[PDB]
Every structure is written in C-alpha cells, then in structure tokens.
Structure 1
Amino acid sequence: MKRVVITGLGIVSSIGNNQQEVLASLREGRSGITFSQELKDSGMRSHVWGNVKLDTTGLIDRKVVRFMSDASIYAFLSMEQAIADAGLSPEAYQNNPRVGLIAGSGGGSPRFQVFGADAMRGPRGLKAVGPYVVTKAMASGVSACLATPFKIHGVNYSISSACATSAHCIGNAVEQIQLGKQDIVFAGGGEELCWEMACEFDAMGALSTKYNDTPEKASRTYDAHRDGFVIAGGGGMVVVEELEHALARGAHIYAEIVGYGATSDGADMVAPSGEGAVRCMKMAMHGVDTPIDYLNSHGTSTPVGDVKELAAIREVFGDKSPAISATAAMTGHSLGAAGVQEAIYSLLMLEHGFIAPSINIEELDEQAAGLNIVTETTDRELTTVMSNSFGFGGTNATLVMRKLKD
C-alpha cells in the first residue's frame, strides 16, 4: 500500500510551547510540572499538574476562538505550527478534498460543560449559557474547531480513546493515506487542564498526591515510590502525508510511520491487562525489519500501570529490549494529547539523535530489573522508535516511526 511519513509537527505542552522549547526541555530533563492553586482550591488531593505556560490571548482570531475550548485552542496552535513546519501554504492544504484532519481529546471540555450547566442554573438561563457552548463541550470539538477555520475539505472527525486518543488519531490518519483516500491528514489532539476534569481522576485515586510540596518530583515513572500520574494539558499535531506526495514537494520528512497497532484488552475497565499491549506492540512491529532503538513508554507513573507495560515489553522483546524512557516523568500525562505529544517527543529524539531521560527514578522498581531504562540524556543515532499509548477501557495504540533514507 501507500507509504506514510510525518512532514511537520506542532506542539504546546507543559515542557514547551513549540518544538524548539520542547527539544530543550527533553535534552535537559526539565520538568513541566508545577503547583496548582486551582487544583488545591477545588478540594483535590493532587495539587500538581503539567500546565501550558502560554498566554493564548489574541493568538487566535476572535471569530474563531469564540467556539473553542482549551483543548481546541492548544490543538489549533499546534496545527498552525505543524502547517508552517511542514512548509504548507493555504493554496496547498485549504479547500482540498485530499487533505483531512483527525484530532480529538479524551474528555472534550468538562470545563465548558460545567460552565453551561452552571450558567443555565443561574437566573439568566439560556442567555448566560450563550450560543458557543456546544462547540466547546462537544466531544469532537478539537476536530470541528480546526477543520472549519483551516478550511479542511477531506476527512474530518475526532477519535476518542482516553489516553490513547491522539495515538489512534495518528494511526487512523495513516490508514486514510494507505487507503488512498487522502494525501495529507493533520492528526493529533488537545486536552484542557482544569479541576473540573482532574477531580474525576483524583476521585479514583489515579493522581499523585504525596508530592505536592515537590511538584517536579511528583511524576516519577518506574520509581518505587510513584503514587499516580500528574495530570497535564496541551496539544500536538503532526502532518501525516503520503510518501510520494511529500517527496514530490521536497518536504522535510521526520520519519516514516512503519507500524501502527491498535488493540483492545477486553478485560479491566481502568487497569491494563498487559496481554493487549503485547499484541499491540507486536502488531506495530509486524513487517518492520529493523530493531526498535528507543521506546517511549506509556509510563504515566502509576503503581500497577508502569510495571504492567514493562512486563508486556519484556514479553515482546525478550532479551533484546530497546532503550526505554517515560517522558511523562517530565511532562506529566496529557491524557488525550499524550499520544501525539509523545509521538512528537519520539520524533524529536529520532530527528536530533538522542534519548530523553526518564527522570525522578530515585529507586528503580524491582519489576524494572533487566531493562534499559535511560535516566540520563544520551546521544545516540536512533533509526526506529516506538511509542505506546494505553487508555481506560483497555484501549491500546502503538506507533513505530523510522527514518527514511540518507
């Protein structure tokens, strides 16, 4: 079938408002986690988050941003970055049936959903709600709010799969190109950061709560003292393009997507079975004649999750396990945006030949023994990288990206 490559990327995360800032943070093992007064004031036990340090005010046209929630804003900014980074101009991607958009969020916008209900319950009712809540709270807000202003004419929808959301978006974009339906598909997602949504995760005890005094140490994937993930927000977008089309326009190709796995655990609702992850990684590795040099694990810094994935990794690679690092230890877990952001971190590592450190590992978990977990920025000529994304509902996504040629 058609070969697919990534020709542009854009990102707004807790560790950088663009790929340059993100690159700098990854190289330095810099944490994007900070103390959140908002989370504390809400009554939560987790008082830390990976927030986007960016004043979005005036960055998007008033008539466009009025329909957007933060997830959409983050994705929109990421898309603007990816478009420029891909070297694409309106005449090329706008009003083009061959150019699509597949991007979503894990929870749409709890903030505006609550805003709507709060306003409605007030004395002004519908007048207080306003006519822009649907597009903001809508589960497809991210795709709707981007496809419209960017004049996308091809595929247009969101894929939702919790923590695997943007990973499946990328995989689905790849499929659209392999099916010969699209030449370019902007894929990714965004996730707002708010107590409205964060309290739901805290309520199930999934968030870190023992390190509120030392925010940068809260997310500690593989550390024996980890106690939950640190919620994060942000966006990411990559330009997925058919190989010949990219070469024809002399695009800059970060890597080719040579593998995409999407499986289901069909077991536990909020806990990984590991079995699903094994099949997912194997599916993404099928046909890949090159070994995985680096693996950006899901590793959100959870007691059971972290180890379950490592067990799956050991089962897939055996004694030939690749270098592993969980960027979440630095960035936190951006839920729906995690897939594309982590795919981007992996692409930056592949592009700049280095492995980002898995920080805050003061005491490696006993179940992370015979594995190569990189805890220090290491320069290395990577060729093939893998990124795993596992969300609630036992949904798994794995992407394998490899350098093209020369």
Structure 2
Amino acid sequence: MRRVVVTGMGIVSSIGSNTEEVTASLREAKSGISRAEEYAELGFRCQVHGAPDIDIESLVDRRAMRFHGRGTAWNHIAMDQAIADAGLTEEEVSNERTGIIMGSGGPSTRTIVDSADITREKGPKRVGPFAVPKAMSSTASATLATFFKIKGINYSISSACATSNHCIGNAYEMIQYGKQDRMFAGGCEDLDWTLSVLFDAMGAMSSKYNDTPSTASRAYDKNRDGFVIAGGAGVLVLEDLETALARGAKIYGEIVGYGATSDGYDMVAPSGEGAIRCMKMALSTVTSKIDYINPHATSTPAGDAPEIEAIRQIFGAGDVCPPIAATKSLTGHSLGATGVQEAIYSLLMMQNNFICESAHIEELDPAFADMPIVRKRIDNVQLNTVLSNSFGFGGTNATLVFQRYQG
C-alpha cells in the first residue's frame, strides 16, 4: 500500500471562515454558538446554533452558484481554500488521477421545502429548473466535481455524523491502493430550520442554555443537555507520498489509520463496543503513541459516556490515556461537516503545538473524573499522532489517525 498525506486544507466553520480564524478560536476558546432567533419564532425548545459568518456572494460567482445550496456553497469556498493552500495548478486539479469524495449528512432541505411550498402556491414550473442538484444527496460531490472539472472518482458518502470521516477514509483507500493519486475529501452541511427542527422534535438539542448561548455546548459537563447544531464545510487535499514530495507539497500530516464499523444495535444511541472495534481498527496500523484524542462527544447525556468507556478500554485512564478535548463545545455539531472539520482542527493543533481547552466545563461529570479531559489549554506540546472519532445515527462509526511526517 502507498502512503497518503494531507497537502492542503480549507474550512468554513462557526469558529472561523479560514484556517487562521479557526486557529485563533481554538487557542482562545472562543465559542461559535449564538442565539437562533428564528428557532424561537418557530416554537423550538432549542434556540441556539453555530452559524458561519461568511459572505458567499463575495467568494462564489453567480453562475458558479446556479446549482449550490448554502451548504455546498460553503463547501465550494473550502475547496477553493484547499486548492490555494496546496498550491495546485489547474492541471493538478483536473486530471484522470484526481478525484473527489465529498458528502453531506443531508442535501439542501431548504431547497426541498421551498420547492414543495412553491409548487402548491404558484405551480410546479415555479420550482425552477435548477433544484435537483441542490436537493440530491450527492450535491456536494456533483457540484464541485462539475465546477472544478474533476475527471477521476466522483461520489458522496453519507453516514450521518460520521459522513466526512468516511469520505476521507475512502479517499485514503483509493490512494493507498493506487486507483487515484490525489483526492479532494470532506463534506458540508447547510444550517436551516427545516433540518434543525427534526432534531429539536427528537429532544436532541440543548435547550437549558438559551439565555447564555455561547456556553450551551459543553461536552463532559455534568449539566450538558444535548448538542448544538451548526453548519459549514471542510476539504482536505490528499496525495500519495511520492506525488506530494515530488511537487514540493506542504505536508500537514500523514493518514496512518482508518477504522469503520457498525454497532448493529440502536438507531440513536451508541453501543460502545462498535466504537472500541472502530478505534482498534484505526490503531492497528499505527506504531506511535496517540498524543491527542478529538472525540465524537457532542454534549449529550447518552453519547458522551459510552465513547469515554471505549477510550478507557483501549487507552486506560488518567495520565497514561491521551489528552481528550471536545472541540464541539466551541463549534457545535456540523453534522456532515464535522469529521473533516475535526481533522482540520487536529492538524492545526499539531501544526501550532497546543491542545485546546475542552470548553464550557463548569462542573465535570463525576463519571469522567478519572480521564485526562483538558481543562485549560496545553501549550508547548509537540503532537506527533492524533486520533479523531465521529459516530453517527444508525450505529455507524469512523475513526481517523493522522501523524506528523518525519520520513
């Protein structure tokens, strides 16, 4: 198998519109969560969200937007950033050896709802002719593949909150086995009431912190009460090692492990044992210690705990376990985007020699008192190997491990 490295990154997040802004937010534990007035107007329990703050029309031209929903527009921006970061030529973007696996946990629900509404109000013609590529589940891959003239692999994986972890892992495999030499991998999610309501109706999102939105997402806090939804996008450029070296690429890290398993248990709640198998599969090809864990931890009563038990099973407790810091306490949960964004956060922490605080822990849940959950930012630390989990509804598990390239 060939070795595979990350040569460029792009991101649109609730905690920044590029990697520099995201880094600053991570350093400073600056929350991306705000009040969602619209949710209040619609009668939601949860009235908080993690909204990007970015001017799409300034960054994606009108014709380029014809087939974009908002989530895939953010993904286009992230793609542009990743291409610029990697320093790719047009030929390097568009060739038979270069593909795309780019996903979202859902398509544009707003397109779907607006189309249904206008059909009934004004007639089917008024849907217009450009809705399918926005509404289809492959929207993120189809739009970017077309616009960037991708010639190799082109499809989307979805797996709920595991989506963009699986996108990256499958892209990794493609390169490992010699089918492609370069891949754009990642994903996105729109932020829209028509999606958020589905989660509010299940009681899954935080509602006890509406009056202090910035602290509503609080993985590992005793009084956590559900996740905070977000939107955004991320892209990694992946290359086989020889390709990267020969062109003088930047190497943000090497992908050294990938796990993908299934709980076969409950639709909404994790089993724990599936996560253990997933992490072990990712670690089976890793020779170095893990220096930092970016957990799935979404700030839910039922979710944060089984993953901690899985981590304890593999790594132990206390100082011998890698430091754990839940970035979702700052960012919220961006669904399809979360895996790739967490890969980016982890790689940026590796680049900058720090581990962020696991934010908003006002009182640690005593169930986790034995674990090295990061209570204050750790500075001047050399991270060489980082692990990130993402687990999704339907019992779907994905883990990635990235390593600092030293030969």
The percentage of counterpart residues that share the same residue type is 61
| Cα displacement (A) at 1:46 | 0.7
Residue number in structure 1 paired with 2:343:
343
| Cα displacement (A) at 1:296 | 0.4
Q: Does the aligned pair in 2 maintain the 1:297–1:324 contact within 8 Å?
A: yes
Q: Does the aligned pair in 2 maintain the 1:353–1:381 contact within 8 Å?
A: yes
Query: Quick one: which of 121, 126, 129 aligns to 2:124?
Result: 126
Residue number in structure 2 paired with 1:237:
235
**What SS does the corresponding residue of 1:349 show, helix, strand or coil?**
helix
Residue number in structure 1 paired with 2:190:
192
| Cα displacement (A) at 1:91 | 2.1
Q: 1:169-217 CA deviation, whole Å, 9 max, x = no partner?
A: 0001001101101110000001000110000001111100111100011
TM-score of the two chains, using structure 2 as the length reference = 0.98
> 1:142-157 to 2 correspondence within 5 Å?
142-157=140-155
In structure 2, what is the Cα distance between the partners aligned to 1:282 and 1:42? 44
In structure 2, what is the Cα distance between the partners aligned to 1:155 and 1:337? 20
> 1:6-405 to 2 correspondence within 5 Å?
6-94=6-94, 96-123=95-122, 125-319=123-317, 320-379=320-379, 380-405=381-406
Q: Does the aligned pair in 2 maintain the 1:31–1:216 contact within 8 Å?
A: yes
**What SS does the corresponding residue of 1:65 show, helix, strand or coil?**
coil
**What SS does the corresponding residue of 2:214 show, helix, strand or coil?**
helix
In structure 1, what is the Cα distance between the partners aligned to 2:366 and 2:70? 39
Q: Does the aligned pair in 2 maintain the 1:162–1:392 contact within 8 Å?
A: yes
In structure 2, what is the Cα distance between the partners aligned to 1:31 and 1:136? 30
Q: 1:77-122 CA deviation, whole Å, 9 max, x = no partner?
A: 001000000111212221x010001001001111111111111111
Q: What RMSD in Å do the two structures reach over aligned CA positions? A: 0.9
| Cα displacement (A) at 1:287 | 2.4
Q: 1:137-171 CA deviation, whole Å, 9 max, x = no partner?
A: 11010110101000000100100000000000000
| Cα displacement (A) at 1:366 | 1.5
Q: 1:240-282 CA deviation, whole Å, 9 max, x = no partner?
A: 1111100010100000000000010000000000100001011
| Cα displacement (A) at 1:383 | 0.4
Structure 2 unaligned spans of 5+: none
In structure 1, what is the Cα distance between the partners aligned to 2:102 and 2:190? 14
In structure 1, what is the Cα distance between the partners aligned to 2:175 and 2:316? 33
Structure 1 unaligned spans of 5+: none
Letter in 2 for 1:120: T
Moved over 4 A (4+): none
In structure 2, what is the Cα distance between the partners aligned to 1:286 and 1:106? 28
In the alignment of these two chains, the number of paired residues is 404
Moved more, 311-320 or 291-300: 311-320
In structure 2, what is the Cα distance between the partners aligned to 1:168 and 1:74? 19
TM-score of the two chains, using structure 1 as the length reference = 0.98
Letter in 2 for 1:307: A
Q: Does the aligned pair in 2 maintain the 1:39–1:194 contact within 8 Å?
A: no
